[PDB]
Amino acid sequence: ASLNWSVIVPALVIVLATVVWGIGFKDSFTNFASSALSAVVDNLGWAFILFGTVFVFFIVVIAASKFGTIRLGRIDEAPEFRTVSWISMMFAAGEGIGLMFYGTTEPLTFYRNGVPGHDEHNVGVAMSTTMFHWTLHPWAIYAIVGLAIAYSTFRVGRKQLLSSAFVPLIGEKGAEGWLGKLIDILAIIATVFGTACSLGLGALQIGAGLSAANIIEDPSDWTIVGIVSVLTLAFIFSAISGVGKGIQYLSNANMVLAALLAIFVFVVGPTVSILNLLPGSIGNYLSNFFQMAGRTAMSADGTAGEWLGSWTIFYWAWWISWSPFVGMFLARISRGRSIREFILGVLLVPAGVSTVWFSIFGGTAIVFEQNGESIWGDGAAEEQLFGLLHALPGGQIMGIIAMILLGTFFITSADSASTVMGTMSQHGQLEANKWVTAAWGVATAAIGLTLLLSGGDNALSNLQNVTIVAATPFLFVVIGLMFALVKDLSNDVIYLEYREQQRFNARLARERRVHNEHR
Amino acid sequence: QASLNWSVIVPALVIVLATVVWGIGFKDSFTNFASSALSAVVDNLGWAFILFGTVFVFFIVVIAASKFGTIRLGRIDEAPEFRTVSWISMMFAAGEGIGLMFYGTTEPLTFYRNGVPGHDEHNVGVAMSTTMFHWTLHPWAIYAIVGLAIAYSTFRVGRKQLLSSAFVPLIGEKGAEGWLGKLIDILAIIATVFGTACSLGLGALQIGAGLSAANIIEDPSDWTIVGIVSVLTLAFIFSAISGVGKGIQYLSNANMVLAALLAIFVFVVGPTVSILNLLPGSIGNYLSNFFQMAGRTAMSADGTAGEWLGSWTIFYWAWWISWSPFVGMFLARISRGRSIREFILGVLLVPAGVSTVWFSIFGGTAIVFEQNGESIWGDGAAEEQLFGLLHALPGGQIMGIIAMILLGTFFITSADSASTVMGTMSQHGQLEANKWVTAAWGVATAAIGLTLLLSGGDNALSNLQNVTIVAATPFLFVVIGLMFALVKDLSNDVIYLEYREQQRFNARLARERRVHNEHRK
Amino acid sequence: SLNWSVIVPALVIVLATVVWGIGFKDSFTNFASSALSAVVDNLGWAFILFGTVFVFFIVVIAASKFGTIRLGRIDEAPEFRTVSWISMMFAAGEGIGLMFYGTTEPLTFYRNGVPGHDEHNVGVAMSTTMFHWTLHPWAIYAIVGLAIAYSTFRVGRKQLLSSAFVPLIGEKGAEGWLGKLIDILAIIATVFGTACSLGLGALQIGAGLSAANIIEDPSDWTIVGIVSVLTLAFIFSAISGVGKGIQYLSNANMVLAALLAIFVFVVGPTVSILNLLPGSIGNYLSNFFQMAGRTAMSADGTAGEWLGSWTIFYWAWWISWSPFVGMFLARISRGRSIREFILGVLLVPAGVSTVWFSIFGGTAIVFEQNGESIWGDGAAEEQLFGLLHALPGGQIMGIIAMILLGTFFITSADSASTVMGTMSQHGQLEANKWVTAAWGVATAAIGLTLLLSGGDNALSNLQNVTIVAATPFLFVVIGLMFALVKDLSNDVIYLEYREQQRFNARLARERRVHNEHRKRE
Ligand SMILES: CCCCCCCCCCCCCCCCCC(=O)OC[C@H](COP(=O)([O-])OCC(O)COP(=O)([O-])OC[C@@H](COC(=O)CCCCCCCCCCCCCCCCC)OC(=O)CCCCCCCCCCCCCCCCC)OC(=O)CCCCCCCCCCCCCCCCC
Ligand SMILES: CCCCCCCCCCCCCCCCCC(=O)OC[C@H](COP(=O)([O-])OCC(O)COP(=O)([O-])OC[C@@H](COC(=O)CCCCCCCCCCCCCCCCC)OC(=O)CCCCCCCCCCCCCCCCC)OC(=O)CCCCCCCCCCCCCCCCC
Ligand SMILES: CCCCCCCCCCCCCCCCCC(=O)O[C@@H](COC(=O)CCCCCCCCCCCCCCC)COP(=O)(O)OC[C@H](O)CO
Ligand SMILES: CCCCCCCCCCCCCCCCCC(=O)O[C@@H](COC(=O)CCCCCCCCCCCCCCC)COP(=O)(O)OC[C@H](O)CO
Ligand SMILES: CCCCCCCCCCCCCCCCCC(=O)O[C@@H](COC(=O)CCCCCCCCCCCCCCC)COP(=O)(O)OC[C@H](O)CO
């Protein structure tokens, strides 16, 4: 296919504008980001918080309805991936960097400071509200988007694009018109900013880790961590060949290293306490699910707005911005699966992986805090993991391994996001241009680095603010995608013979009633 | 022309007239009896109300989710005679309107200011959740049960449009025409009269408060209430005896338009952002606390929630059970040809969402005022809350008048609809009843409401609530039996006969086989 | 023929326990305490997690397509009427345990509170009593009974725990060493769970005799006499070769339990109990997942001892009872569907337990609130009679409760012994009466051994040894889930579609790999 320049040029111009604003005009960019966060949070926290749970309800009911039997492909089709392989391939979609960053920080900071409507030093609350942001809502969003693309491209044979999934609502004219172009541009921009958030978190934490081992300098975030991890691997893996064979190796190394780190912290750490937190975390998450889903700026006597902006609305925006990439990824590896099976796997397997990960790491941190040891230290979120690792025997080698894992996650996430963006910018071609992929990867890495540099001391806050503002337009795209998906599922070939009969009988009944009214 | 059911008219008419005379000429005796009867009823049946109120919700969810959800309310492969949008629009009628207007400000504001048993004061989430508790799912679960029973009896099986006909599976045709069916219909008419009189009394009281606030009348004297009720009853009487159904549908459209206008005015001129924040908060805290409130009895809070329960939750239970004949028959009428699952889902969810939005807007504005220093509580009279809320907003002087007009139109339309259903139930389930019987029933409900308001005196809302609870207690058992009748009716469907006969035959064979095996050794 | 390879190890372990307990009491008690500490600290997480995984698993199995499978031949209707089947679920379950903890558990939760909650809270006191007795125990029993019933009726295998693992180990492991190990573990777990029940019954009977002033004070010789008398009546019933006396006792169990519950209901605070019914159910559904998430590091690392005393003990007790109740449920529930079986087994005993605990615990808590108090010296065994004597006419009801405990002793012994004889007779339903008598005597001896060894801390001894003996069978019950899923998936009604899916998926994988290789060009 050809390049959709009408969709590349707008998004690329927006990205260049954001980068120039952040780099050359740090103060103005930071002020604007703070003001836009204030306005967006105050005026649309209701939208984020309401539709986060509407997505979960919607995907659950879609799975449990008659559409669950539909198969993503030809009728009576069987899937191309084994169930074990299908489950394993979902690891590459999850947050390697997000988990590596927040596994220790989030449960520990919620244990220490508490959350709105709750007191400090509550393990159940800490683990439950860590599981709130990471288990069902993100993967309900991802299931919705991936199911939309899967039904559009496999069942109906349309192009693999976000705009195509809206064909039921806006028709073909809209899909090829200005509205389809707008949807595709918003998808590309949201993916860019959502991936740049992860790249910024990973670079920040890698710098902190290098400082922990005492091998770092000050400008390493810009001069080494970003540009090296981008150029020396991602470009040479993309531009050199269609498949560089390094992405597969790194995607397997991610699994191996994450398993090794989790097993180290599990065995060397307080194993019994972690095993106690498994059922405790799951039970206290299921108990507090709706209480946390109803936490708005009007909660805790109006004092929850700042916390929600810093913690919950940030995650809403982050997951919404991830939606296009993760949806395309899940759709690509789920052909032939049924809708019910797809939804169940996508919702539950990563939820369990996240639950276990947070159990190990947050539980070790909370147990240390309870005993008297404090991995908190200064309080930086990027230094908690290495403090936790160093607190355990043989922690130096594992800290180095954690830095290696962070670098591999950086490379893998950037490469996969660039692949999906290139596909979306090339009229839905599965194998997009290599140079378009490299350009989009450069753009994402540059945006993440620019957010970090503009934030400076408050790098994390600047990152979160720009992610929150950048994902506001795509929240409505996902909301309308729910409607488009329902309208597409209803108008399935298997249901048309029943729908015509229902329409005919309803018309007969309505005309009979109208005639009786005339009488 | 179905003959008049005099044997069902007289037992309910005599009770209504006895209540009117007793409450008018003997205000003190009537109030004392109502108070004592509330004490006894609440003490010895709050467990029944609270348990079966949630059993209704569970029963409806199970019925929709079970194999019965695919059955059509009519002949097989039938289709609805109303478009889905028209069905949803018609659902708004037969709701409260007057209850929603009366309580939208008062109830969440009251819970926020004073708290609820087992919880502390100044809790927005708890106030909104326990307001949603009384107005969203258990109400419409009860209405779905009754309307589904009536719809199945009348469309699928082709019986009369009655509540006794829904008990045929339990007591049979002889029972339906026997004394038990007559008793069920009498209780249905009594419950309709008292559930309607409660809303009419609330509307008259709030219109009096509005006239007092608008300065049209200096005070809301008893004669003011009498005049309001007389004028509104005269309007309803003219609408009915005129024999033309155009004016009533015009007033229904006006009710929808004016309710939307008031909601939009408070949403826009009020704290829009807080109103929108309270939507997810209200829903989440409702689903979080659902079973905590479902398990709230007089034994909660170390045995101290009895007075609060009788004031709010048991009163609502009685009110929503008293409405059950009217709202059930209304929903049954407009739901021809729908499947059981579709009927249940729409009836449960659409009104719940509308109530959620209404309470969010009005209660959230009141609570936002409370938090910011302003207090529309004033003297604390419930009837004066709404006009305190509107008069605290720019341009609200005219919207208070619009609120009074909306209350008047709600009064007229609700009286007409309830009286139409009552006339149906007193004429062997005729779809259209005699004009004079409908007029008489509507005037009787108005007279009961006026009697309650006047006998209450300085405490009118309390007397209204007490009489509502006492009058609705008998029909809780009718609804409970209707659950069994509905299950038996759905089980004995034509599509399920062959499978059931196969199972019965095989079961007899297996039982004789095991009896023989025991005989062996 | 006797499976001596299974009898001899179980007999050796049981006799070793008896010799250790009587001969060396200090050593036995020290080992029991140390083993309780170790197993609790290291596997309370396993107990707590899998107790709720069982509920999730059985609910999902009932909901899924497997719920349509019929236990037996296709179109085979059940042998017992639904009334008979429902009533037969009372013989299997817990009568002695219910009588022992009917008052003690809610009363002590109300008095002392539970981890993460304040004391003197009726809602939690009843919700966490319902937690330990309603859905987790019966989820375990339903899983085990369903596995046994499917293996023995659908597939025609022998009625054993070993034959239910055939999906995982083939007939080679079913008859190999692993099947023998599973059978031995099932026998030992049944012996020790039934011994825990019998020891509780003997303690309660001694407490009742002390209360009735028949004995001046309890003594070890009194417990020995009680256990000897009851097991002698048992041995006579078993060796007599006539089950008429046992059927009489099993009916007397229901009659007397219903009589006692109705007495406490009518003569106790009826309205408070009725209030507690919906309160208990609602607070159970509200707090279900908060109680399911209670671990050794809840309430700031202070719930370990409370969990070991209450929650982990009940988990171990149910897991040790699971072979018996599973075999019982499989025997009486042939021809049922998986969905019907699961729903009935989960819901009927849960409702019965809810009513029982509502009555007795609500009576105790209402006495505590009003000013009275049945706590007395704090002994768990003395609470029930302390509750009875507080009510008028309780002097006779104390002896009625003692008689009921004796009948429960005999009948529970006989059902457990019959299951053990079936296990040791290669799954033969008509178990040898001498093996049955030997197993019953061994159970009584183990219960007496735990009581005597514990002495003053008799209940602690019982619970410690029960947890230790039930720890091994937890993994068997966990593996039953996988074995049952493999049984159900590989069913004749699904094998054709499974073959079609396998072939199509192989074609799809071949296409994808060939396409990838082609594109790799
Ligand atoms: C924590 C919370 C938890 C909550 C959990 C919630 C979870 C939900 C689970 C959902 C599961 C669904 C699964 C089953 C689906 C099966 C349905 C189906 O299709 O079966 C056929 C079944 C029957 O079919 P039918 O007989 O043909 O029906 C006729 C159609 O109704 C009449 O035809 P039509 O005119 O509609 O035709 C239009 C056509 C296609 O439409 C078009 O013509 C499209 C035109 C193009 C528009 C542009 C689209 C492109 C936009 C993309 C986004 C871009 C953004 C970019 C951003 C840029 C920023 C810079 O659409 C359709 O195909 C019909 C579906 C329309 C759905 C309408 C529902 C509106 C909901 C309103 C309430 C909620 C709003 C929330 C507001 C927020 C605050 C609360 O369909 C229906 O169910 C239809 C009825 C649906 C309900 C209608 C409701 C009307 C208004 C309700 C208001 C009152 C209630 C709300 C609360 C109270 C407010 C006061
Ligand atoms: C105090 C509160 C509780 C405290 C907490 C404790 C928990 C409560 C204990 C519950 C324990 C579990 C259940 C045990 C019951 C076992 C028996 C049974 O019903 O199962 C066998 C049941 C019947 O089988 P069967 O015994 O073989 O029947 C044929 C025999 O030939 C039988 O031969 P037959 O045909 O001659 O049998 C007689 C009858 C056919 O049925 C019978 O066998 C007799 C009636 C059945 C007993 C029902 C027990 C279970 C339900 C509890 C009732 C209350 C709440 C639920 C309401 C019912 C909705 C299903 O047929 C007739 O000829 C009609 C005779 C008249 C019937 C009664 C009519 C009067 C109703 C009473 C109320 C009226 C006014 C006073 C109001 C009261 C003051 C508060 O078998 C089935 O499974 C059939 C299923 C039918 C369709 C299922 C779909 C509907 C279910 C919806 C879900 C409900 C949600 C509720 C959840 C709420 C949670 C908060
Ligand atoms: C320790 C680290 C790892 C832990 C990870 C946890 C893993 C859990 C993942 C759950 C399974 C995901 C993969 C499922 C693939 C197989 C298909 C499947 O399970 O779904 C079927 C769904 O089948 C059903 O019909 C519904 C069955 C319900 C199964 C529910 C199991 C999950 C229950 C979750 C409980 C709550 C968990 C905690 C939530 C936070 C498929 O339906 P179908 O349309 O193909 O029809 C098949 C058949 O005809 C039956 O329909
Ligand atoms: C919250 C506001 C935003 C909502 C966004 C919705 C986005 C999707 C829109 C898709 C268009 C259709 C919307 C209306 C759907 C109604 C439900 C529905 O269709 O249910 C189907 C699937 O049903 C389900 O499994 C459940 C449906 C969803 C309802 C459950 C929602 C739970 C919400 C509870 C909230 C708490 C209550 C108080 C607060 C409101 C089938 O049932 P039916 O009635 O259409 O047909 C029945 C029969 O087969 C004949 O057709
Ligand atoms: C604690 C008190 C008891 C529990 C109360 C809460 C219960 C909530 C959940 C109840 C779920 C019941 C769902 C029933 C769906 C039936 C589905 C169906 O089509 O039937 C199948 C499953 O069948 C069943 O299991 C039928 C059981 C239905 C009865 C359910 C009773 C609910 C509880 C009643 C007591 C309520 C007490 C409330 C007061 C506290 C087919 O199986 P079968 O062919 O063997 O069934 C034969 C039957 O005649 C077919 O209709």
CSV table of N, CA and C in Angstrom, one decimal, chain A residues 182-255:
chain,number,residue,atom,x,y,z
A,182,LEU,N,-9.1,12.1,10.9
A,182,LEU,CA,-8.9,12.6,12.3
A,182,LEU,C,-8.8,11.5,13.3
A,183,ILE,N,-9.6,10.4,13.1
A,183,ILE,CA,-9.4,9.3,14.1
A,183,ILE,C,-8.1,8.7,14.0
A,184,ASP,N,-7.5,8.5,12.8
A,184,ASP,CA,-6.2,7.9,12.6
A,184,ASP,C,-5.1,8.8,13.1
A,185,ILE,N,-5.2,10.1,12.9
A,185,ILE,CA,-4.3,11.1,13.5
A,185,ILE,C,-4.3,11.0,15.0
A,186,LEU,N,-5.5,11.0,15.6
A,186,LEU,CA,-5.6,10.9,17.1
A,186,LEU,C,-5.0,9.6,17.6
A,187,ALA,N,-5.2,8.5,16.9
A,187,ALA,CA,-4.6,7.3,17.3
A,187,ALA,C,-3.1,7.3,17.2
A,188,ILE,N,-2.5,7.9,16.2
A,188,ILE,CA,-1.1,8.0,16.1
A,188,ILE,C,-0.5,8.8,17.2
A,189,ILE,N,-1.1,10.0,17.4
A,189,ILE,CA,-0.6,10.9,18.5
A,189,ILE,C,-0.7,10.3,19.9
A,190,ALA,N,-1.9,9.6,20.1
A,190,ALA,CA,-2.1,9.0,21.4
A,190,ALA,C,-1.0,7.9,21.7
A,191,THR,N,-0.8,7.1,20.6
A,191,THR,CA,0.2,6.1,20.8
A,191,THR,C,1.6,6.7,21.0
A,192,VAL,N,1.9,7.8,20.3
A,192,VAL,CA,3.2,8.4,20.4
A,192,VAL,C,3.4,8.8,21.9
A,193,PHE,N,2.4,9.5,22.4
A,193,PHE,CA,2.6,10.1,23.8
A,193,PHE,C,2.6,9.0,24.9
A,194,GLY,N,1.7,8.0,24.7
A,194,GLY,CA,1.6,6.9,25.6
A,194,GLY,C,2.9,6.1,25.6
A,195,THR,N,3.5,5.8,24.5
A,195,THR,CA,4.8,5.1,24.5
A,195,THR,C,5.9,6.0,25.0
A,196,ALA,N,5.9,7.3,24.7
A,196,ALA,CA,6.9,8.2,25.2
A,196,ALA,C,6.9,8.2,26.7
A,197,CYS,N,5.7,8.1,27.3
A,197,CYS,CA,5.7,8.0,28.8
A,197,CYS,C,6.5,6.9,29.3
A,198,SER,N,6.3,5.7,28.7
A,198,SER,CA,7.0,4.5,29.2
A,198,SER,C,8.5,4.7,28.9
A,199,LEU,N,8.9,5.2,27.8
A,199,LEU,CA,10.3,5.4,27.5
A,199,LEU,C,10.9,6.4,28.5
A,200,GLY,N,10.2,7.5,28.9
A,200,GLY,CA,10.7,8.4,29.9
A,200,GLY,C,10.9,7.7,31.2
A,201,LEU,N,9.8,6.9,31.7
A,201,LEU,CA,10.0,6.2,32.9
A,201,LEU,C,11.2,5.3,32.9
A,202,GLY,N,11.3,4.5,31.8
A,202,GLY,CA,12.4,3.6,31.8
A,202,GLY,C,13.8,4.3,31.8
A,203,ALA,N,13.9,5.4,31.1
A,203,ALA,CA,15.2,6.1,31.1
A,203,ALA,C,15.5,6.7,32.4
A,204,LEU,N,14.5,7.2,33.1
A,204,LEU,CA,14.7,7.8,34.4
A,204,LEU,C,15.1,6.7,35.4
A,205,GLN,N,14.4,5.6,35.4
A,205,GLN,CA,14.8,4.5,36.3
A,205,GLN,C,16.2,3.9,36.0
A,206,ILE,N,16.5,3.8,34.7
A,206,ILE,CA,17.9,3.3,34.4
A,206,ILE,C,18.9,4.3,34.9
A,207,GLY,N,18.7,5.6,34.7
A,207,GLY,CA,19.6,6.5,35.3
A,207,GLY,C,19.8,6.3,36.8
A,208,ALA,N,18.6,6.2,37.5
A,208,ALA,CA,18.7,6.0,39.0
A,208,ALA,C,19.4,4.7,39.3
A,209,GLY,N,19.2,3.6,38.5
A,209,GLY,CA,20.0,2.4,38.8
A,209,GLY,C,21.5,2.5,38.6
A,210,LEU,N,21.9,3.2,37.5
A,210,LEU,CA,23.3,3.5,37.3
A,210,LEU,C,23.9,4.3,38.5
A,211,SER,N,23.1,5.2,39.0
A,211,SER,CA,23.6,6.0,40.2
A,211,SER,C,23.7,5.0,41.4
A,212,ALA,N,22.8,4.1,41.5
A,212,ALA,CA,22.8,3.2,42.7
A,212,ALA,C,24.1,2.3,42.7
A,213,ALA,N,24.5,1.9,41.5
A,213,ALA,CA,25.8,1.1,41.4
A,213,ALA,C,27.0,2.0,41.3
A,214,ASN,N,26.8,3.4,41.3
A,214,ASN,CA,27.9,4.3,41.4
A,214,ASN,C,28.8,4.3,40.1
A,215,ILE,N,28.1,4.3,38.9
A,215,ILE,CA,28.7,4.3,37.6
A,215,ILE,C,28.2,5.4,36.7
A,216,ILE,N,27.6,6.4,37.3
A,216,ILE,CA,26.7,7.3,36.5
A,216,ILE,C,27.3,8.8,36.6
A,217,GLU,N,26.8,9.6,35.7
A,217,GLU,CA,27.0,11.1,35.7
A,217,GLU,C,25.7,11.8,35.6
A,218,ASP,N,25.7,13.1,35.5
A,218,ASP,CA,24.5,13.9,35.5
A,218,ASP,C,23.7,13.9,34.2
A,219,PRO,N,24.4,14.2,33.0
A,219,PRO,CA,23.6,14.3,31.8
A,219,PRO,C,23.4,12.9,31.1
A,220,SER,N,23.6,11.8,31.9
A,220,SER,CA,23.4,10.5,31.3
A,220,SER,C,22.0,10.2,30.9
A,221,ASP,N,21.0,10.9,31.4
A,221,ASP,CA,19.6,10.7,31.0
A,221,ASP,C,19.5,11.1,29.5
A,222,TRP,N,20.1,12.2,29.1
A,222,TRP,CA,20.1,12.6,27.7
A,222,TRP,C,21.2,12.1,26.9
A,223,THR,N,22.4,12.0,27.4
A,223,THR,CA,23.6,11.7,26.6
A,223,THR,C,23.8,10.2,26.4
A,224,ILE,N,23.4,9.4,27.4
A,224,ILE,CA,23.6,7.9,27.3
A,224,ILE,C,22.3,7.2,27.2
A,225,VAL,N,21.5,7.3,28.3
A,225,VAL,CA,20.4,6.4,28.5
A,225,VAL,C,19.4,6.5,27.4
A,226,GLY,N,19.0,7.7,26.9
A,226,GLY,CA,18.1,7.8,25.8
A,226,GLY,C,18.7,7.5,24.5
A,227,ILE,N,19.7,8.2,24.1
A,227,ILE,CA,20.2,8.1,22.7
A,227,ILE,C,20.8,6.8,22.4
A,228,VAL,N,21.5,6.2,23.4
A,228,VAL,CA,22.2,4.9,23.2
A,228,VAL,C,21.1,3.8,23.1
A,229,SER,N,20.2,3.8,24.0
A,229,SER,CA,19.1,2.8,24.0
A,229,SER,C,18.3,2.9,22.7
A,230,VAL,N,18.2,4.1,22.2
A,230,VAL,CA,17.4,4.3,21.0
A,230,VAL,C,18.3,3.8,19.8
A,231,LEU,N,19.3,4.6,19.5
A,231,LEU,CA,20.1,4.4,18.3
A,231,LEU,C,20.7,3.0,18.2
A,232,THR,N,21.6,2.7,19.2
A,232,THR,CA,22.5,1.5,19.0
A,232,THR,C,21.7,0.2,18.9
A,233,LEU,N,20.5,0.1,19.3
A,233,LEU,CA,19.7,-1.1,19.1
A,233,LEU,C,18.5,-0.9,18.3
A,234,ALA,N,17.6,0.0,18.6
A,234,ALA,CA,16.3,0.0,17.9
A,234,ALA,C,16.5,0.3,16.4
A,235,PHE,N,17.3,1.3,16.0
A,235,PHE,CA,17.5,1.6,14.6
A,235,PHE,C,18.1,0.4,13.9
A,236,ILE,N,19.2,-0.2,14.5
A,236,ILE,CA,19.9,-1.3,13.8
A,236,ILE,C,19.0,-2.5,13.7
A,237,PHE,N,18.0,-2.6,14.6
A,237,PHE,CA,17.0,-3.8,14.5
A,237,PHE,C,15.9,-3.5,13.5
A,238,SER,N,15.6,-2.2,13.3
A,238,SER,CA,14.5,-1.9,12.3
A,238,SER,C,15.0,-1.8,10.9
A,239,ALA,N,15.9,-0.8,10.7
A,239,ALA,CA,16.3,-0.4,9.4
A,239,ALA,C,17.1,-1.5,8.7
A,240,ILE,N,17.9,-2.3,9.4
A,240,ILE,CA,18.8,-3.2,8.8
A,240,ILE,C,18.1,-4.3,7.9
A,241,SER,N,17.0,-4.8,8.5
A,241,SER,CA,16.2,-5.8,7.8
A,241,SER,C,14.8,-5.8,8.3
A,242,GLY,N,13.9,-6.5,7.5
A,242,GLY,CA,12.5,-6.6,8.0
A,242,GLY,C,12.4,-7.3,9.3
A,243,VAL,N,13.2,-8.3,9.5
A,243,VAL,CA,13.4,-9.0,10.8
A,243,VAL,C,14.9,-9.0,11.2
A,244,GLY,N,15.3,-8.3,12.2
A,244,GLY,CA,16.7,-8.3,12.6
A,244,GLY,C,17.1,-9.4,13.4
A,245,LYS,N,16.2,-10.3,13.9
A,245,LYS,CA,16.4,-11.4,14.8
A,245,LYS,C,16.8,-10.9,16.2
A,246,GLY,N,16.9,-9.6,16.5
A,246,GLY,CA,17.2,-9.2,17.8
A,246,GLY,C,16.0,-8.9,18.6
A,247,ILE,N,14.9,-8.6,17.9
A,247,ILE,CA,13.6,-8.3,18.6
A,247,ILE,C,13.1,-9.6,19.2
A,248,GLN,N,13.2,-10.7,18.5
A,248,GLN,CA,12.8,-12.0,19.1
A,248,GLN,C,13.7,-12.4,20.3
A,249,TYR,N,15.0,-12.2,20.1
A,249,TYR,CA,15.9,-12.5,21.2
A,249,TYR,C,15.6,-11.6,22.5
A,250,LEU,N,15.4,-10.4,22.2
A,250,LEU,CA,15.1,-9.5,23.4
A,250,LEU,C,13.7,-9.7,24.0
A,251,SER,N,12.7,-10.1,23.2
A,251,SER,CA,11.4,-10.5,23.7
A,251,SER,C,11.5,-11.7,24.6
A,252,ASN,N,12.4,-12.7,24.2
A,252,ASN,CA,12.5,-13.8,25.1
A,252,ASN,C,13.4,-13.5,26.3
A,253,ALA,N,14.4,-12.7,26.1
A,253,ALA,CA,15.2,-12.2,27.3
A,253,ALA,C,14.4,-11.5,28.3
A,254,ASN,N,13.4,-10.7,27.8
A,254,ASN,CA,12.5,-10.0,28.8
A,254,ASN,C,11.8,-11.0,29.7
A,255,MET,N,11.2,-12.1,29.1
A,255,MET,CA,10.6,-13.1,29.9
A,255,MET,C,11.5,-13.8,30.9
